[PDB]
């Protein structure tokens, strides 16, 4: 390269073998992606099948105990372990794999391997985009859920007391984590989460509306009732009428796209911005910087007991979550909370 | 055409002259491997000390280290 002889070496041989067409492309990123992602997925599937949670959370979280696909999870370590990395050679496991599975080290294994697998996969998109000479907008978009994974599974438990309050890898455990932020943080009320919700809903709207608009503004190209066979990949003509689409959406919605590149850039921009804002909100929640209450409304409700709002209803509901959650959610607190102090409404 | 000539520019001129002058081959990339792997080892050592996944005889890793 660059009018130089460039004497061939083992690095060039390795690059030539790694950048070759096959079923699954490897590249250099495959030296990290394939083991990291394979071990993360296999560790999650092994924890959801055999590895229990009886000592970390006092819970059943695997198929071998009777849990199904929804209720099984790779559980987070105990809060007394703090933010320990829980290596199998660490001071906690000390070489014992069987006790390492019971100590919750599988969560740290799966989480770290999944984070490195995300790094490797986005490096894989970078390397493939450089191989075929395309811009890496794919991994510019894939920067968003890596940031989300980092902020949720790493930054939030790092800011809190320990990996115990990290999300356990599983369906119902994620639901518990979600209801935990409802009750303890009022994560719905957070404006960064509000922007994240807006971004995801707008991205779903954009995907549905773009697919419907393209498929309903198609050209004939027919002599056949099935339009899917009316397409040729090797051509340089548009198959859906952008002019007709713009006219339809201008006369229905008021505004319409006139630039395909700007349309697709917007379809990229909305979910990435929403997910990044949600990541910033979870980083805020990592330090318990919650948008939990409106102080002026709180003083008004305290000094005037006839002032009820849905926000005050949400505050009471979150108090109910914390009270009826803490005793069986945080076993390290040993909260043997009696019945008479638990908040409870009229009858029910 | 030359730019604005200055005594300081003439003094610092040889410090910015060889734009694009590099070494042939790979150069010191074995030294890259050595230095980068030792830095990763040292960084990991720091992380294990501060995460308490590695315990030494003389470290405490707590506020009583001020004692």
């Amino acid at each position: 390269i660059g009018t130089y002889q460039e004497k061939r070496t083992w690095f060039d041989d390795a690059d030539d073998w790694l950048r070759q067409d096959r079923f699954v492309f490897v590249g250099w990123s495959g030296l990290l992606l394939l083991p990291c992602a394979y071990f993360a997925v296999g560790g999650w599937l092994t924890g959801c099948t055999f590895v229990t949670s009886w000592y970390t959370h006092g819970l059943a979280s695997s198929y071998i105990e009777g849990c199904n696909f929804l209720t099984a999870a790779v559980s987070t370590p105990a809060n007394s372990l703090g933010h320990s990395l829980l290596f199998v050679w660490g001071p906690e496991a000390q070489g014992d794999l069987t006790r390492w599975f019971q100590l919750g080290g599988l969560w740290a294994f799966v989480a770290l391997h999944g984070a490195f697998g995300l790094i490797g996969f986005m490096l894989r998109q970078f390397e493939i985009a450089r191989s075929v000479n395309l811009r890496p907008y794919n991994a510019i978009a894939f920067s968003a859920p890596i940031a989300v994974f980092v902020s949720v599974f790493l930054i939030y438990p790092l800011g809190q007391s320990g990996w115990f309050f990290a999300p356990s890898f599983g369906v119902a455990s994620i639901f518990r984590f979600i209801l935990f932020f409802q009750g303890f943080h009022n994560w719905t009320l957070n404006p960064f989460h509000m922007m994240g919700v807006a971004g995801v809903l707008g991205a779903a709207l954009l995907c549905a509306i773009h697919g419907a608009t393209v498929e309903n503004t198609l050209f004939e190209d027919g002599d056949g009732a099935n339009t899917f066979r009316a397409f040729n990949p090797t051509q340089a003509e548009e198959t859906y009428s952008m002019v007709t689409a713009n006219r339809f959406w201008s006369q229905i919605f008021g505004v319409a796209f006139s630039n395909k590149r700007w349309l697709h850039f917007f379809m990229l921009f909305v979910p990435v911005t929403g997910l990044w804002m949600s990541a910033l909100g979870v980083v805020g929640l990592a330090l318990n910087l919650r948008a939990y209450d409106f102080v002026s409304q709180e003083i008004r409700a305290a000094e005037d007991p006839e002032f009820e709002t849905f926000y005050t209803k949400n505050i009471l509901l979150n108090e109910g979550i914390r009270a009826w959650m803490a005793a069986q959610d945080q076993p390290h607190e040993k909260l043997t909370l009696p019945e008479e102090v638990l908040p409870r409404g009229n009858a029910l | 055409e030359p730019g604005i000539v200055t005594p300081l520019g003439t003094l610092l001129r040889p410090l910015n002259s060889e734009a694009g002058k590099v070494l042939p081959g790979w150069g010191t990339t074995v030294l890259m491997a050595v230095a980068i792997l030792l830095f990763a080892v040292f960084l990991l050592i720091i992380l294990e000390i501060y995460n308490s996944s590695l315990i030494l005889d003389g470290v405490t890793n707590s506020w009583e280290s001020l004692a």
């Binding site: 390795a14 050679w89 001071p91 | 315990i55 005889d57």
Partner: peptide
């Protein structure tokens, strides 16, 4: 001296080098 945690950490570094060499060997064995 050599604490058990430091000894296990050194064996972990050795195992990481060993598994990296094994990955490189499996790659160069095509």
């Amino acid at each position: 001296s050599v604490t058990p945690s430091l000894k296990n950490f050194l064996l972990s570094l050795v195992a990481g080098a060993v598994v990296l060499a094994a990955i490189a060997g499996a790659v160069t064995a095509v």
